[PDB]
Write a protein that binds this ligand. Structure first.
Ligand SMILES: O=P(O)(O)O[C@H]1[C@H](OP(=O)(O)O)[C@@H](OP(=O)(O)O)[C@H](OP(=O)(O)O)[C@@H](OP(=O)(O)O)[C@H]1OP(=O)(O)O
Ligand SMILES: Nc1ncnc2c1ncn2[C@@H]1O[C@H](COP(=O)(O)OP(=O)(O)OP(=O)(O)O)[C@@H](O)[C@H]1O
Lengths: 293, 1012
């Protein structure tokens, strides 16, 4: 619990901060010092900014600086440009007891011109070159599907609301819906297989694949190739949680080996377990080589 | 036969039944002043078969200020007024047989020759002669419709008399309404309840007909008269004897004919039925009628109009008005100011008011020969007293004539206001019909004719089309496919050679903001918009609000029109209005469950776009992104997920190579669209399937689809096949001839084509009316290997050249009939309607709806242009807020409503300080001036401390942002990093609310200057 308290104390000071992601030349043409998803959208945005687009963003900044979620199980970290508020990056640590447990994911956030009349645009960058569709609502291309973002089917009350919806609500919905312990059932049609042996078997297949992919990208590629906006955050988080990470990966290796005897899916479990062991050895080496922040 | 290519916009207003009656009507028009010329022009543009203009007066120099066809040569030759303009009028519409006459009119004149005319219009005629003619006209069998119109200075009079009884065939231009029935009870009277989500929107006493009613099957085909109970219920009479209701039911509104009564002109002078146009003065029209009757009696008594500034004439006119007023039924008090101004401006002639009255009178004439709308009953008085009321008591020397062409307007508004008008700089956006009429009004008023300052700038990018000749009267058949702005500018100078006009082809948009910068807007004094869309209106309104310049706006939808007046520091801007947008049809309703013909039309339009605009563009883009099909094969074999590769492969594998294959593809598309879809939907939802509550799924608004069987003998099937084949051949660049379109060839070609047997898939059907179109379905491995095989076969068959990998893209042309886009859309929509038992539409309605063609007529455009030009005078004169009048009119009823423009709403910010949308705070600084200095200066100047500073999209300073308190010490130039072009910069500021946790209160925009 002392580790939890230290994580709360340290990462809280690192939850919200500025970062120089955008610079302009002598004429004013935009040039970016970090990777970003909406390059064309940013470069094509006009200067006819609505006052609401600034007031709402300032109020959201106050709300984020005051009440960003924070726990060693799951936390939200936000970085915004020193000059442009409409561009942001969001780093989320996966809640425990899920295939995303302790995995850190980087998101690119853009605000459209008519914001807050329309939901903002969020894209995922931790897909590992679009290799893995980490969630049924999170396609490998980086698309994020949510009712509040109008990118997922739902009732109007679940949709975007310029008067009541907020970015904090979006983050809470992301944590509560995408990073769940049963991502396989998020897909339509698959949710009705919940409780059936075939549905549970397919869920275990998907969860093993997601676990190995998370270890590969959301942990190993993050420590090896950290994003500059979250470099200190990622190192501190992995150093603080390192023992839990190795324990969790050994537990996952033990869990996936339980289904290696399966004939429908067992070979996939064997392949994912071999990949997980390789990535676990690599992660253990990296954590042993990781200096104390 | 109606020339649709010329008349379509007017047809969408009037209808074929009315137009086929106007083709057999003769109209007699007397008096060729400004008002008579406007009426004649509107009637000729409308397409009346025969018009007989008549006038006995000769041309004078005074006439040039009211007539836009006369020339100085006409005055030199002393030609007859009617014959001097007969030649020019005929050019407006070659289909119209215009004639001229000059028979003297007086007491001894024989009126028997008038019987050959259906309608008679009299202008600038003595009252007793009008009385005699009206007595003769209404006594004929059938009665001759009588209309009288007059303009005296700033006062106008319009009168109608359509006989003892007039049979109106349609009380309004609204389409008949369809009401879906939710429940009906067996009661006396039976209470009918519509679907609870849609309002009743009907009135007691109307007639409805019923169809598709289950349970009470006897109500099918019956006609009932309803009584409104609630905004969602009504009663149609006793239904207890009927069967028990089950479900369904649709009621249709029936347009019953209505009879309107009129009275003789001589008796109508007492107790006149006057149309109220200003509800703040419900008794003004009666006073105006009394004053005009007194003026006519003065003309009878003295054989001359009152002289301007003559107190004796004004006193005599007041005495006559007082004597006349007591004879009326109501005995109103004589308005001294109205009589005084009528005496003051008796000899004047205000052109914009004349144009507005001419438009209204022409609409009444069109109603007279068709009965398409409820006519005026009976008097209508339009005022312009606001123009001269703000002048106080100007001297008579301002109004005395001086010999130039502007004596007509000088006697109306005085010399100083005319001088102000001549020095105006007006930026006219859009050169449509409203723009052309406004340019004609400018030419008549002499706007910008001063050699020192006056200048008019008109900009429009569109070219002249044949359909524009119907209402944009400045153009001619030989001006087709030439710029609107250039042609209008070159035509305007003929009306008034002293005018100075500049024409531009630029579209008004942010991309062209460089030309129309703030310095240009500062130069202009008034901005007038004749736009046809909303986005450009909002952009122009924002620019005018930024530059603090008045704006005049107007728009016409058929017989409805409105005028918007915006004045700095006085009225709200156009952006302050946020009326609800067009309601989108639900995606599930459009794709799967259409209820009305409009849904099928929209579906056909979307299908056409996706088939000939979207997918060919994607094909071209895909084959330009990747060079060769072999490269695509190598990439997909290595797992590369090229953007939409499988769809492009599917398009490539189905590419036709000759006309026969195009016909086969069209046949397959017909089968897929109109047989397989219905079978799939019925497989998902059988006819007897029931919901969770046990109610039948197939009930209103949903309708059960029926599979259609192909049959080449039916004209609709042949039309669809021909259109689809031609469009696909054009897209695939397959050459063809008209002989290939013969039904014999199509039958011979299709005889060898096998029709694939249908199989039911299990695709999810979206029944949610709140859902939208889902994104791409994940491609299965089977589809992947099928695409691989298809493109490998294509490569083997050498179908991989650049010609194979490019397709022509078709734009949705709608004005031309030979391209066949409208034909294809009509055929597809009618077939889809036949699927769901929806009543089929026709080609013209499909053209109107699919093309989003806004109905328009010349009369409404002329009226709104006259009103806008009238308000332009008030804007130029700088009159107080009370003088400006927003207008909304609908000539169908007819109804004209004047209303004070919306007052600007002060927004309280803090501690009693308030600002308006026109406000903009300013701060002057220097290079060592800092952000903290900026905050201190703002707080000192306006008594309130800023809480955040924003430079457009860039954030300058927000307290909650870490490390931004350091920016207070930074110099303004360094933190802004501005360009040397601008001496200033615009920032957005917000302030602290009274309550903690509330959003920062938005302040007015702030302009900071980098130097003093
Ligand atoms: O592209 P869309 O305009 O949305 O229309 C598509 C398209 O039909 P067409 O190519 O004939 O216009 C599909 O065919 P493909 O291009 O994918 O071959 C067809 O899919 P099927 O071949 O499976 O019938 C689908 O129909 P559906 O969604 O019922 O499967 C239909 O959609 P709509 O006609 O409803 O637009
Ligand atoms: N942003 C803009 N800047 C300048 N002119 C514009 C702009 N948007 C529209 N227009 C002009 O508005 C005019 C509209 O004219 P109008 O309403 O009489 O109908 P139309 O476009 O000529 O014909 P129809 O609507 O019947 O096809 C067009 O001539 C077009 O050039």
């Amino acid at each position: 619990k002392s580790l939890e308290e230290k994580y709360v104390a340290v990462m809280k000071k690192l939850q919200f901060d500025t970062f120089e992601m955008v610079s302009e030349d002598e004429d004013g043409k935009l040039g970016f010092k970090v990777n970003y998803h909406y390059m064309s959208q940013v470069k094509n945005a006009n200067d006819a900014n609505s006052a609401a687009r600034a007031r709402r963003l300032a109020q959201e900044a106050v709300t984020l600086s005051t009440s960003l979620p924070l726990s060693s199980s799951s936390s939200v970290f936000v970085r915004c440009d020193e000059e442009r508020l409409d561009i942001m990056k969001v780093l989320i640590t996966g809640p425990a007891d899920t295939p995303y447990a302790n995995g850190c994911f980087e998101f690119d956030v853009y605000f459209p011109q008519d914001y807050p009349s329309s939901p903002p645009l969020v894209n995922l960058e931790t897909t590992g070159g679009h290799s893995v569709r980490f969630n049924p609502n999170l396609y490998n291309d980086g698309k994020v599907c949510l009712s509040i973002l109008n990118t997922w089917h739902g009732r109007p009350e679940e949709k975007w609301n310029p008067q009541t919806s907020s970015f904090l609500q979006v983050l809470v919905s992301v944590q509560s819906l995408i990073l769940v312990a049963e991502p396989y059932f998020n897909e339509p049609g698959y949710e009705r297989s919940r409780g059936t042996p075939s549905g549970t078997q397919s869920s275990r297949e998907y969860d093993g694949n997601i676990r190995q992919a998370t270890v590969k990208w959301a942990m190993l590629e993050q420590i090896r190739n950290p994003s500059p906006c979250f470099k200190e955050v990622i190192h501190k988080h992995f150093y603080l949680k390192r023992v839990e990470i190795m324990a969790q990966c050994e537990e996952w290796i033990a869990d996936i080996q339980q289904y290696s005897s399966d004939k429908r899916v067992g070979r996939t479990m064997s392949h994912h377990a071999a990949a997980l062991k390789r990535h676990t050895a690599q992660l253990r080496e990296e954590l042993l080589k990781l200096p104390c922040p | 036969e109606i020339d649709d290519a010329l008349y379509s916009r007017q047809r969408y207003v009037l209808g074929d039944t009315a137009m086929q009656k106007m083709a057999k009507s003769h109209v007699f028009l007397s008096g060729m002043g400004g008002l008579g010329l406007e009426i004649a022009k509107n009637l000729v543009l409308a397409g009346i078969k025969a018009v007989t203009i008549h006038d006995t007066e000769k041309c004078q120099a005074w006439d040039l200020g009211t007539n836009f066809f006369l020339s100085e040569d006409d005055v030199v030759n002393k030609r007859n007024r009617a014959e001097a303009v007969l030649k020019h009028i005929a050019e407006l519409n070659p289909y119209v047989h215009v004639t001229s006459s000059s028979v003297p009119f007086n007491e001894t004149t024989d009126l028997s020759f008038l019987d050959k005319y259906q309608c008679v219009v009299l202008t600038e005629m003595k009252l007793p002669l009008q009385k005699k003619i009206n007595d003769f006209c209404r006594s004929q069998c059938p009665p001759i419709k009588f209309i009288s119109a007059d303009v005296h200075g700033i006062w106008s009079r319009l009168f109608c008399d359509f006989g003892d009884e007039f049979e109106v065939l349609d009380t309004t231009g609204e389409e008949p309404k369809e009401i879906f029935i939710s429940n009906i009870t067996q009661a006396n009277p039976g209470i009918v309840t519509c679907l609870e989500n849609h309002p009743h929107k009907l009135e007691t006493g109307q007639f409805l007909t019923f169809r598709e009613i289950n349970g009470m099957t006897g109500l099918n085909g019956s006609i009932q008269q309803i009584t409104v109970i609630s905004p969602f219920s009504f009663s149609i009479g006793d239904t207890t004897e009927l069967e028990p209701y089950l479900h369904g039911g649709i009621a249709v509104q029936v347009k019953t004919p209505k009879t309107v009564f009129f009275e003789s002109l001589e008796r109508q002078l007492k107790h006149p039925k006057c149309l109220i146009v200003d509800f703040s003065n419900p008794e003004a029209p009666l006073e105006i009628h009394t004053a005009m009757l007194a003026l006519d009696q003065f003309q009878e008594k003295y054989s001359r109009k009152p002289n301007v500034g003559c107190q004796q004439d004004s006193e005599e006119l007041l005495k006559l008005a007082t004597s006349i007023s007591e004879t009326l039924e109501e005995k109103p008090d004589v308005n001294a100011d109205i009589v005084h101004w009528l005496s003051w401006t008796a000899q004047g002639f205000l052109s914009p008011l004349a144009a507005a009255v001419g438009g209204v009178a022409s609409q009444e004439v069109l109603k007279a020969v068709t009965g398409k709308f409820s006519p005026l009953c009976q008097w209508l008085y339009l005022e312009a007293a606001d123009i001269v009321e703000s002048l106080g008591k100007p001297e008579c020397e301002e109004f005395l004539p001086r010999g130039d062409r502007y004596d007509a307007l000088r006697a109306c508004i005085g010399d100083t206001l005319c001088q102000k008008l001549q020095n105006l700089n007006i930026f006219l956006v859009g050169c449509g019909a409203i723009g052309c009429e406004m340019l004609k009004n400018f030419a008549l008023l002499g706007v910008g004719t001063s050699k020192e300052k006056g200048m008019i700038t008109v900009t429009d990018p569109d070219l002249i089309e044949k359909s524009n000749l119907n209402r944009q009267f400045l153009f001619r058949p030989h001006h087709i496919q030439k710029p609107k702005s250039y042609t209008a500018a070159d035509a305007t100078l003929k009306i008034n050679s002293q005018i100075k006009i500049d024409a531009h082809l630029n579209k008004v948009c942010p991309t062209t903001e460089t030309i129309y910068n703030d310095e240009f807007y500062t130069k202009q004094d008034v901005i007038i918009t004749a736009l046809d869309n909303v986005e450009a209106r909002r952009y122009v309104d924002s620019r005018c609000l930024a530059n603090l310049r008045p704006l005049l706006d107007s728009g016409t939808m058929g017989t409805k029109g409105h005028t918007e007046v915006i004045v700095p520091h006085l009225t709200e801007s156009y952006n302050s209005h946020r009326d609800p947008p067009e309601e989108e049809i639900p995606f599930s309703t459009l794709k799967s469950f259409p209820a009305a013909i409009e849904h099928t039309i929209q579906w056909a339009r979307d299908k056409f776009e996706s088939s000939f605009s979207h997918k060919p563009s994607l094909f071209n883009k895909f084959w330009q992104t990747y060079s060769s099909a072999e490269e695509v094969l190598q990439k997909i074999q290595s797992g590369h997920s090229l953007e939409g590769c499988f769809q492009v492969i599917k398009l490539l594998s189905r590419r036709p190579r000759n006309w026969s294959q195009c016909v086969e593809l069209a046949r397959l598309k017909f089968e897929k669209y109109f047989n397989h879809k219905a079978l799939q939907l019925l497989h998902c939802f059988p006819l007897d399937i029931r919901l969770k509550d046990g109610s039948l799924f197939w009930q209103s608004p949903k309708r059960p689809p029926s599979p259609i069987k192909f049959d080449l003998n039916e004209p609709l099937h042949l039309s669809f096949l021909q259109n689809a084949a031609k469009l696909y051949a054009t897209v695939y660049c397959i050459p063809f001839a008209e002989e290939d379109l013969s039904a014999d060839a199509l039958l011979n070609i299709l005889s060898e084509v096998k029709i694939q047997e249908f199989k039911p898939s299990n695709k999810v059907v979206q029944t949610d009316e709140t859902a939208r179109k889902p994104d791409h379905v994940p491609i299965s491995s089977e589809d992947e290997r099928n695409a691989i095989f298809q493109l490998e076969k294509a490569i083997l068959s050498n179908e991989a050249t650049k010609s194979d990998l490019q397709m022509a893209v078709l734009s949705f042309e709608k004005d031309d009939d030979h391209n066949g886009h409208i034909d294809f859309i009509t055929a597809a929509s009618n077939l889809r309607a036949k699927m769901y038992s929806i009543e089929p539409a026709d080609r013209f309605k499909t053209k109107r709806i699919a093309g989003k063609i806004i109905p328009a007529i010349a009369t409404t455009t002329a009226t709104v242009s006259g009103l806008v030009a009238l308000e332009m005078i008030k804007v130029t004169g700088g009159y107080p807020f009370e003088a400006y009048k927003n207008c909304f009119l609908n000539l169908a009823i007819p109804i004209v409503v004047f209303t004070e423009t919306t007052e600007v709403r002060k927004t309280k910010i803090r501690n009693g300080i308030s600002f308006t949308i026109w406000d903009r705070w300013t701060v002057h600084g220097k290079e060592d001036f800092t952000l903290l200095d900026f905050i201190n200066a703002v707080k000192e100047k306006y008594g309130i401390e800023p809480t955040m500073v924003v430079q457009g999209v860039k954030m300058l300073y927000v307290p909650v942002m870490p490390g931004h308190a350091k920016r207070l010490k930074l110099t303004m130039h360094k933190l802004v990093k501005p360009t040397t072009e601008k001496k200033y910069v615009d920032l957005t500021v917000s302030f602290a609310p009274d309550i903690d946790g509330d959003e920062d209160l938005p302040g007015p925009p702030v302009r900071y200057y980098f130097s003093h």
